[PDB]
């Protein structure tokens, strides 16, 4: 019996395990309870915490994936494939892990409390590429995940009512980072010095943490990868979750009263409720779920946009960034014309009605300024330009706009920020060149996984993800992604709205930049808001 | 006759003319200034269209330049170049209606490539007796004959009661179209080829080019065209028949008149002075770069707005040259846009920029001003005050017509015409403007018609070879429809603008250097984007 494997939390004992990570064993505690399991009348309630355990408490493999849609698209391909479950689905999910170097740190030590995202509808903490060996061995971080209840289970919400409030997902993170806070320091990790990170619907996830009060006391910095809570799809107001609550229940034969209509979707099998989830939508779209956050007035105050323009965020800091393609892994989703077979050329009108899809809740006259401002006029028609302008709106639109967005409110209101734009393709990738850097490719380079010689990365590759984990864990000391030791020349200034400097990460040295597609997420943030409201 | 010389004696339709033997620097030149071409449309003729002048007796002398057509004088800035050159310099009167012709002297053997210049001015102002538009270096150096007209401006030349018999509109084109057909008739006699006619002229001069483009009577009268800054289509060139009634019963009124009929009859009591002086008093808006009185569309002289026409004409037949000044809209902010100035520096606030936007584009509801200023904001210096001054003069330069010129050479083109396109960037080493405004409105015209060549001007060398170039590229295109020398390889060659390529070429003291899009990007804003954003809100 290993004693460094074992730890008494407040809820009984554990086992972990030891993992080999390349330069050395790290202690990992997989599989935790958190709260207990949201199943029978637990389902859309928020999550309690779990009872006390007799005995030793085995965690040493990963829990069950909380039930979600499983995607289809290329069935077998791994560049879809690596973000399915790859566990058993299970509305008993709510279990958290811990990696942690070995033997257990000597001194309290930061923690890292990793997000994942997948649109508020899927993902998991189990996947490869969230991997915590990598930083806990080489950066001697303790590294913190949890699952939370995703699509119907985590957000349907008939908003006011007690048996379905909304945003129960949101309430598991939480309960998690409580749990970090009363156990962490059992492991070796500092519960003063908490980071939460996370990508896509992670990130939007960490920046409502932000946005809510209530989880403020539990952490005190954040990085928001790809993802934002402002933005057009990381929420929804009342009434549109009242809507699309309603419309599931009828799809699925509730009620043959939110009470009433509540209690008979309880009576559902999982995927019955996951069979519809995509048909609740208001128009035809990509980058857009059906139940994420609701602006409830409780988790939320008010909407994301209405809390960064007026929130005090001076002793705050924050890490955020987006990758150099962030729309073209969504094309393929419903855009005629693309695939990850082809090259995806596109003619003009593909192009009006791919911007359609894309700005769904755009009216005629957004929709064509939104094509003439994309256009290239000395090559209005190019195809190659055409599909690019095509996965640049999907971007621009949800996530580098809405990035700076709240990278400049956040700037302006006392926090200290810092930015960064990821442009490097990993030489493993498997989606087609014409799709560049795909939203979520920065994150198995943040992890460390290059640093395992059998996923065949290269050299540079490996030197790199060394760069970008120092970079991380330093933010997480300090505050300050910026090397302590490395005095040399090129330093990640803090993101302002005067200057507006960010950095590029890439194989090449830290190069510094201003303006954060400043012009066009004018138009976005700006223009496009006083559009569609006169209309 | 007897003891005159016998090299300046020609007869036109309408009688015998003497002319005068000037002298450019590079020798003499044949001029015949002030020649009558309309009865005097003074008194109940006033608004009228022009009638032919009716023939003389004895000799004419047409050694002087008659008198300008009466006109606001500026004062902005009294005594200044700047603005003094464009003054009248003779005498302003409402019996204003001659031309004026240079040819080589002794006059040409073989018919010569006539050029016929259309004096700018807003349609309120202008004179083709400026030192500027002075032909003899054309004529001289090139062995052009160089005709320009005198036409009427303001109300005299503009105001109209559409419908009416007393008021109908368009009589200063119609003064343009009657020495077009005096061109016709009479420059045989002058050693010059009818059959080889181009307009050119700048700002409401090449409108007016691009007008008689779009009549179809004027167009059996030229050959090929010259826009110089300016423009048919746009946003100030035109008035529909309702704003020019609004605008004409507006001044009828300021000036005590009072059924069009007694309406005009009063206005024609009036002095010519008393209508001038409330001249500008008729614009709806705050503005800058708006005038008064211009051409109506009357469904007569213009059967359709200029943009109806230029986007469903067959022009497979035309030859155009259309071009800009590199700073269109700086000369026109301190007319009217607070915190410009030719004294200082002109350094605005993010909130003069706001208000400027809202006077050089006085037609914009306010999303469509906020369109503009969102547009042409640098945000990563969004409140400096360089660059809100230069995009002030950007705003101005690019609404009145970088873009409608950049609309028209891609509707002709389209449209089976040939055109050819150039930025003029070079900045006159004698300019009096401060240097801030760059190379302003109207200031490549003393390089077309050779002034440099001067040598009491005290231009530069490079500036005299310059203007050569650029009298070259002018006549031969006249003479071709072409301004590439057919001889001369080795230079660079002009292509044809294109919707495909787009294709331009910038005139500076460089060789011809080519240049695609003609300031595609904010020009989509404007001609694609603006006018359905209006159409809305
Ligand atoms: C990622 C994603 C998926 C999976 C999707 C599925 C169905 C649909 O209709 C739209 C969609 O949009 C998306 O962006
Ligand atoms: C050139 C020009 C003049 C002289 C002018 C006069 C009065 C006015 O009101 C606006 C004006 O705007 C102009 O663009
Ligand atoms: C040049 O920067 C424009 C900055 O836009 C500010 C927002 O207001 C504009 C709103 O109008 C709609 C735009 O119409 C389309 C034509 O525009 C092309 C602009 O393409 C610039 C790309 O870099
Ligand atoms: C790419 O493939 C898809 C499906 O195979 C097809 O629908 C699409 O039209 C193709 N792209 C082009 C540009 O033809
Ligand atoms: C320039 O002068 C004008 C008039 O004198 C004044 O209104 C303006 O504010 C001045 N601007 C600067 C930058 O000095
Ligand atoms: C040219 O320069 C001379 C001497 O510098 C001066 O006397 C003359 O007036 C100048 N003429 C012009 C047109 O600038």
């Not at 970090?180 to 908490?194: H, K, L, R, T, Y």
């Not at 000395?378 to 195809?383: K, R, V």
């Not at 810092?418 to 030489?427: M, N, T, V």
Request: one cysteine or more; aromatic letters at 12%; glycine letters at 8%.
């Amino acid at each position: 019996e290993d004693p460094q494997l074992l730890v008494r939390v407040r809820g009984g004992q554990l086992r972990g395990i030891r993992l080999k990570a390349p330069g050395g064993p790290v202690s990992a505690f997989l599989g935790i309870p958190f709260a207990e399991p949201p199943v029978g009348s637990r389902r859309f309630m928020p999550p309690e915490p779990k009872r006390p355990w007799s005995g030793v408490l085995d965690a040493t493999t990963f829990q069950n994936v909380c039930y979600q849609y499983v995607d289809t698209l290329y069935p077998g391909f791994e560049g879809t494939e690596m973000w399915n479950p790859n566990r058993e689905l299970s509305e008993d999910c709510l279990y958290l892990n811990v990696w942690t170097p070995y033997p257990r740190p000597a001194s309290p030590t930061p923690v890292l409390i990793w997000i994942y995202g997948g649109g508020f509808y899927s993902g998991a903490a189990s996947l490869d590429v969230y991997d915590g060996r990598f930083l806990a061995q080489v950066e001697g971080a303790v590294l913190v995940s949890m699952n939370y209840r995703v699509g119907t289970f985590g957000f349907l919400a008939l908003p006011g009512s007690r048996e379905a409030p909304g945003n129960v997902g949101l309430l598991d993170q939480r309960l998690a980072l409580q749990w970090v806070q009363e156990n962490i320091a059992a492991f070796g990790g500092d519960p003063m010095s908490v980071t939460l990170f996370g990508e896509s619907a992670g990130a939007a996830s960490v920046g409502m943490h932000i946005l809510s009060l209530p989880s403020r006391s539990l952490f005190h910095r954040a990085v928001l990868q790809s993802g934002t809570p402002n933005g057009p799809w990381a929420t929804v107001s009342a009434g549109e979750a009242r809507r699309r609550a309603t419309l599931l229940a009828r799809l699925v034969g509730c009620p043959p009263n939110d009470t009433e209509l509540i209690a008979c979707l309880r009576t559902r099998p999982a995927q019955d409720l996951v069979d519809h989830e995509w048909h609740v939508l208001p128009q035809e779209s990509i980058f857009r779920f059906s139940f994420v956050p609701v602006v409830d007035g409780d988790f939320l105050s008010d909407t994301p946009e209405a809390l960064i323009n007026t929130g005090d965020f001076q002793d705050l800091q924050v890490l955020v960034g987006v990758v150099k393609d962030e729309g073209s892994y969504f094309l393929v989703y419903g855009v005629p014309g693309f695939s990850k077979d082809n090259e995806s050329l596109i003619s003009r009108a593909q192009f009006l009605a791919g911007v359609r899809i894309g700005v769904p809740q755009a009216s005629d006259l957004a929709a064509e300024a939104v094509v003439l401002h994309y256009t290239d006029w000395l090559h209005p028609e190019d195809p190659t330009h055409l599909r690019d302008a095509m996965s640049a709106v999907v971007g621009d639109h949800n996530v580098v706009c809405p990035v700076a967005q709240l990278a400049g409110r956040l700037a302006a209101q006392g926090a200290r920020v810092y930015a960064y734009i990821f442009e490097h393709r990993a030489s493993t990738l498997t989606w087609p060149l014409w799709m560049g850097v795909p939203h979520g490719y920065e994150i198995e380079f943040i992890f460390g996984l290059p640093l395992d010689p059998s996923l065949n990365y290269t050299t540079e590759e490996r030197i790199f993800a060394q760069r970008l984990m120092k970079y991380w864990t330093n933010f997480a000391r300090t505050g300050d992604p910026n090397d302590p030791r490395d005095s040399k020349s090129p330093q990640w200034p803090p993101y302002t709205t005067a200057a507006q400097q960010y950095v590029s990460l890439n194989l090449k040295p830290l190069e510094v930049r201003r303006g954060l597609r400043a012009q066009t997420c004018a138009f976005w943030n700006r223009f496009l808001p006083k559009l569609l409201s006169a209309t």
